[PDB]
Amino acid sequence: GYVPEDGLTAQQLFASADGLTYNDFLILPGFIDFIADEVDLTSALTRKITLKTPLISSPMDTVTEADMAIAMALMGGIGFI
Amino acid sequence: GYVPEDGLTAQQLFASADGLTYNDFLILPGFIDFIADEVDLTSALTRKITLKTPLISSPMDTVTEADMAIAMALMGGIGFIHHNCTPEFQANEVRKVKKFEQGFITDPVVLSPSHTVGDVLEAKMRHGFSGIPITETGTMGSKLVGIVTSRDIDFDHTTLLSEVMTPRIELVVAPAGVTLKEANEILQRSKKGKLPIVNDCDELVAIIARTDLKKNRDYPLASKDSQKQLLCGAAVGTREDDKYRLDLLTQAGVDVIVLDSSQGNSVYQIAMVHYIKQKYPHLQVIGGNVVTAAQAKNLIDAGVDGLRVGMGCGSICITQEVMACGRPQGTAVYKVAEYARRFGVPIIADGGIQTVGHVVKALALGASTVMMGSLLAATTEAPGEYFFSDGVRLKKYRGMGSLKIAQGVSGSIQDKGSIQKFVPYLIAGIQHGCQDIGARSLSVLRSMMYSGELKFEKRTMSAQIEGGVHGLHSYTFLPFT
Numbered sequence: 001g002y003v004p005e006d007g008l009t010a011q012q013l014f015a016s017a018d019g020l021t022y023n024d025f026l027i028l029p030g031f032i033d034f035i036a037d038e039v040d041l042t043s044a045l046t047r048k049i050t051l052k053t054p055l056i057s058s059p060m061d062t063v064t065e066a067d068m069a070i071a072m073a074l075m076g077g078i079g080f081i
Numbered sequence: 082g083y084v085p086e087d088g089l090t091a092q093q094l095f096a097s098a099d100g101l102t103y104n105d106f107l108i109l110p111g112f113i114d115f116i117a118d119e120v121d122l123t124s125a126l127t128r129k130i131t132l133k134t135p136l137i138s139s140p141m142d143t144v145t146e147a148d149m150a151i152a153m154a155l156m157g158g159i160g161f162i163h164h165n166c167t168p169e170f171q172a173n174e175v176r177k178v179k180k181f182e183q184g185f186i187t188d189p190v191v192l193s194p195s196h197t198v199g200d201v202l203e204a205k206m207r208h209g210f211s212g213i214p215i216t217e218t219g220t221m222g223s224k225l226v227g228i229v230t231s232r233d234i235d236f237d238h239t240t241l242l243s244e245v246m247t248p249r250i251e252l253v254v255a256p257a258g259v260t261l262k263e264a265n266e267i268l269q270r271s272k273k274g275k276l277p278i279v280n281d282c283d284e285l286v287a288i289i290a291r292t293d294l295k296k297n298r299d300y301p302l303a304s305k306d307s308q309k310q311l312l313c314g315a316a317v318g319t320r321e322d323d324k325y326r327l328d329l330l331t332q333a334g335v336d337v338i339v340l341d342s343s344q345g346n347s348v349y350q351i352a353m354v355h356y357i358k359q360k361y362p363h364l365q366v367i368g369g370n371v372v373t374a375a376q377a378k379n380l381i382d383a384g385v386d387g388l389r390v391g392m393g394c395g396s397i398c399i400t401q402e403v404m405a406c407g408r409p410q411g412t413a414v415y416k417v418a419e420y421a422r423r424f425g426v427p428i429i430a431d432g433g434i435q436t437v438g439h440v441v442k443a444l445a446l447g448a449s450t451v452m453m454g455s456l457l458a459a460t461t462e463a464p465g466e467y468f469f470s471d472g473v474r475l476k477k478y479r480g481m482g483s484l485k486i487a488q489g490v491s492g493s494i495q496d497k498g499s500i501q502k503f504v505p506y507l508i509a510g511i512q513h514g515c516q517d518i519g520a521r522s523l524s525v526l527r528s529m530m531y532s533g534e535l536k537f538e539k540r541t542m543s544a545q546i547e548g549g550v551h552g553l554h555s556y557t558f559l560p561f562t
């Protein structure tokens with residue numbers, strides 16, 4: 001009835017100061033009891049503004065003229081000029 | 082008289098959570114007092130099934146049509162049939178894998194003596210089974226009339242079949258209700274190749290054929306169940322419509338199923354194990370890919386008879402880099418095989434295996450068997466075609482997640498020739514490395530694992546750049562493939 005805890009918790013990784021990046025670690029799998037597209041994504045951008053999706057286009061000249069702002073705001077995100 | 086212990090024991094490696102893989106460590110050598118090919122390789126697949134060799138072929142579409150299942154079950158291993166095709170096709174595949182060698186042949190093709198001999202040729206092309214018993218009504222519940230054979234078909238073909246078949250008076254036969262060891266001797270001492278079996282009423286009940294005895298000398302390590310026929314496995318998915326697929330596979334006589342999924346722990350999968358083990362009590366079941374003991378509890382509690390471990394480690398996958406979710410293969414196999422050992426289920430390692438050394442490392446860590454993908458692609462009996470590229474004979478290697486999102490790639494592997502020579506090279510390079518380790522059997526090897534007698538060391542990246550090194554101008558390997 002007992003199963004050993006495996007894997008470093010969130011805080012135990014970034015205690016030893018090796019300066020990890022997204023490439024350096026994995027997230028262990030859990031239990032599944034819902035359909036893959038049931039899950040919610042609503043996320044705050046700033047205190048008063050919320051977006052239906054966590055994606056933002058970067059304000060670089062080579063990424064965001066108005067046509068991207070439109071096409072990304074139309075799908076949850078936000079666009080910075 | 083004292084010699085210091087050198088090297089980390091089994092448990093001391095995976096305590097410091099660096100997430101080691103098969104490349105990150107070595108196994109220190111022991112003492113040798115046996116010949117390189119003396120050792121046993123007998124290994125459990127599931128609670129009730131044992132194999133004379135730890136090799137398993139992957140259930141990918143690009144690896145396991147029936148011809149590989151045959152050619153690897155014939156050499157100790159077992160073969161799982163890919164599931165991404167219509168249930169009727171998959172049932173035919175597992176049926177013609179079961180029927181390649183036989184004890185008492187119980188549904189032979191039989192013809193009535195009024196058939197045209199050109200219909201024997203049609204049936205021979207339809208099945209491949211070239212010698213055929215003849216009975217009156219033309220089914221399995223009639224009196225013997227004779228046998229027609231390929232040695233009765235060399236001479237258009239419009240003749241009635243009674244003219245050419247051998248008469249029952251001259252045909253030697255054995256009485257029914259005889260065990261498969263007296264009928265075998267009665268064939269051997271009455272040296273004609275297709276001995277039938279008839280009851281006292283002189284009606285057909287079974288037949289046996291000399292080539293099945295010949296195959297038992299030629300392939301002595303083959304894995305055959307009680308009825309003396311090859312063992313076969315099906316992958317099946319977890320979806321509602323695979324509940325229909327299950328019955329077609331079970332009517333075809335499959336003996337193991339693997340509940341194929343990316344992440345084994347789901348409520349859909351745990352409910353599927355219950356449905357299988359309640360409806361079909363005989364079938365052994367293997368659980369979907371697990372990487373941590375905290376999810377191997379739900380699978381064993383469900384009732385699964387074995388587990389396959391590892392997710393997102395593999396040649397063909399891109400699943401870590403899409404899902405963010407996974408675990409390094411070397412840590413996973415040990416950290417779940419130690420736990421699953423208590424309840425007495427076999428872990429089977431799965432993919433990320435690309436050399437014989439990785440096979441030995443995966444067996445000396447807890448895995449009862451190792452499941453091969455890329456290392457069996459482009460062998461002769463892997464399905465498909467040899468599309469010559471820029472100076473290379475190579476064959477397809479498609480990941481199932483490679484065409485809602487795509488979580489595997491689609492690529493190619495260079496030709497490796499017949500699996501019939503490749504599997505003995507793996508066997509002879511496994512036991513020859515188990516000799517250097519110092520273990521007389523794989524059971525002894527995992528006892529050494531769990532007793533602390535085996536000792537590992539970590540290998541820096543600077544020490545992975547070793548063997549076949551950058552100091553050569555150019556080189557050629559030359560294994561026996």
Ligand SMILES: NC(=O)c1ccc[n+]([C@@H]2O[C@H](COP(=O)([O-])OP(=O)(O)OC[C@H]3O[C@@H](n4cnc5c(N)ncnc54)[C@H](O)[C@@H]3O)[C@@H](O)[C@H]2O)c1
Binds near residue numbers: 036341398482488
């Ligand atoms: N890359 C890998 O990790 C890997 C390994 C082996 C096989 N596969 C193959 O790729 C696919 C991976 O997806 P999967 O393993 O989740 O199986 P799947 O393809 O059947 O599942 C598809 C999706 O629907 C869900 N699903 C599964 N069974 C369900 C059910 N009964 N009812 C409702 N939803 C269900 C899953 O959560 C998943 O999001 C499989 O079809 C398998 O053939 C992938």
Ligand SMILES: Nc1nc2c(ncn2[C@@H]2O[C@H](COP(=O)(O)OP(=O)(O)OP(=O)(O)O)[C@@H](O)[C@H]2O)c(=O)[nH]1
Binds near residue numbers: 189208211212275291
């Ligand atoms: N495909 C198929 N094979 C069967 C069937 N029943 C038995 N066999 C097997 O087919 C194999 C070949 O049978 P044989 O009768 O020896 O074939 P053969 O052509 O007469 O003899 P060979 O030329 O030596 O192959 C044996 O292993 C049989 O057990 C069947 O219905 N279909």
Ligand SMILES: Nc1nc2c(ncn2[C@@H]2O[C@H](COP(=O)(O)OP(=O)(O)OP(=O)(O)O)[C@@H](O)[C@H]2O)c(=O)[nH]1
Binds near residue numbers: 182
């Ligand atoms: N007809 C037939 N006989 C076989 C086949 N395989 C093995 N036999 C023989 O049938 C008999 C079966 O007895 P078993 O006690 O099951 O044989 P075994 O000792 O397990 O020997 P193996 O099956 O060879 O490992 C033996 O004489 C075997 O050699 C087969 O596919 N067909």
Ligand SMILES: Nc1ncnc2c1ncn2[C@@H]1O[C@H](COP(=O)(O)OP(=O)(O)OP(=O)(O)O)[C@@H](O)[C@H]1O
Binds near residue numbers: 253
């Ligand atoms: N038990 C038997 N008793 C008598 N005749 C048989 C018996 N079994 C087969 N025959 C007949 O004897 C001849 C050869 O039988 P055999 O068993 O050697 O055929 P086969 O092994 O299939 O021949 P081949 O391998 O050359 O194609 C054929 O005419 C065949 O019909």
Ligand SMILES: O=c1[nH]cnc2c1ncn2[C@@H]1O[C@H](COP(=O)(O)O)[C@@H](O)[C@H]1O
Binds near residue numbers: 435456480482
């Ligand atoms: O993306 C993938 N899709 C399907 N199966 C995969 C994938 N990646 C690896 N595998 C699994 O791992 C094995 C393939 O071994 P590999 O060739 O070493 O990667 C198979 O037996 C599968 O269970």
